[PDB]
Amino acid sequence: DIFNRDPRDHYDLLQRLGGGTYGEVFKARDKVSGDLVALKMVKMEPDDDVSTLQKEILILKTCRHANIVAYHGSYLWLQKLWICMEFCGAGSLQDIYQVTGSLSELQISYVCREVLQGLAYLHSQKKIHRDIKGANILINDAGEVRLADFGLSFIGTPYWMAPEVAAVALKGGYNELCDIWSLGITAIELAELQPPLFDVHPLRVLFLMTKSGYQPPRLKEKGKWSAAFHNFIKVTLTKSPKKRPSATKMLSHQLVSQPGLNRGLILDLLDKLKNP
Ligand SMILES: OC[C@]1(F)CN=C(Nc2cc(F)c(Oc3ccnc4[nH]cc(C(F)(F)F)c34)c(F)c2)OC1
């Protein structure tokens, strides 16, 4: 459901957060709640069809889980769409680790369980995130973890595309289990400050993956991590999606099911951020 009103009534905008990849996102206080919200402002061109986004907004609203950024309500007004969202004060894990350096085996483990909690719920709703990485895992001042979900014309013009071709332009080859893979890369990203093959051209990384011989990547330093963290990487990055375990199966992995995993590990992290 979309509300048709100036949202500058309801909310005072307190600080501009957004930059390159996030675009325009504002920290804002709710005039009624007195509560803190993130307002993501979307720019809309005349020939941008509104009715097509209303289909992508349902998905955001009926996504109700602690481990997913809560949707509050969209606002169309003056050729702009403002999406109101749970605020996460520490921004993304990427913002964090670029200052704090590498995350610890136990820090990464709690992040891997909270994410799986969110993916396991998404999947149960037959939804697929498509973009698990550091930049899309957000952190609140409590040190709790929240998956940011978001929601091309030069893939071709569709008018001539045959239907099977059009089926892929919307769906990609994406599968619920492709989100699991991305977590494995993300875990390495948290460990190493960059995903495998960051120093390699993207096209080449795409070719290399589609070679028959392609080898799932690994943690650089053997001794630095437990057998558990090693096995978590091995299993999440299984090549064949037919054999890659689901998010519930992964929640019963020893790396994420161990005790002592909780938000303190991150509060540590958020302290490390204040006091270098
Ligand atoms: O281009 C990258 C930079 F220049 C360097 N760092 C950032 N950090 C950054 C900036 C933002 F605006 C972010 O968005 C939020 C911030 C707080 N609470 C949020 N709740 C939901 C969101 C989101 F809109 F879904 F993302 C959100 C964010 F998560 C991180 O972006 C600038």
Numbering used by the authors: 7 to 157, 170 to 294
Quoted passage from the original study:
MAP4K1 activity is enhanced by prostaglandin E2 (PGE2) and transforming growth factor beta (TGFβ), immune modulators commonly present in the tumor microenvironment. Through its proline-rich domain, MAP4K1 binds to a diversity of adaptors in hematopoietic cells, including those involved in T-cell receptor (TCR), B-cell receptor, and cytokine-induced signaling.
Encouraged by the properties of 11, we synthesized fluorine containing oxetane 12, which showed a comparable activity and selectivity profile, accompanied by reduced in vivo clearance (CLb = 1.3 L/h/kg) and improved bioavailability (F = 69%). However, the overall kinase selectivity of this molecule, in addition to its stability profile, revealed significant challenges. In addition to challenges with hydrolytic stability, 12 also displayed plasma instability. Most problematic though were cardiovascular toxicities driven by residual ROCK2 activity that were observed in an in vivo rat telemetry study, where 12 produced a dose-dependent decrease in mean arterial blood pressure (MAP) after a single dose (10, 15, 30% reduction compared to baseline in MAP at 15, 30, and 60 mg/kg of 12 respectively). Furthermore, 12 showed a positive signal in the micronucleus test, a result which we attributed to the overall unfavorable kinase selectivity displayed by 12, in addition to the lack of Rho kinase selectivity. With these parameters in mind, a further campaign was initiated with the goal of improving both the stability and the kinase selectivity profile of 12.
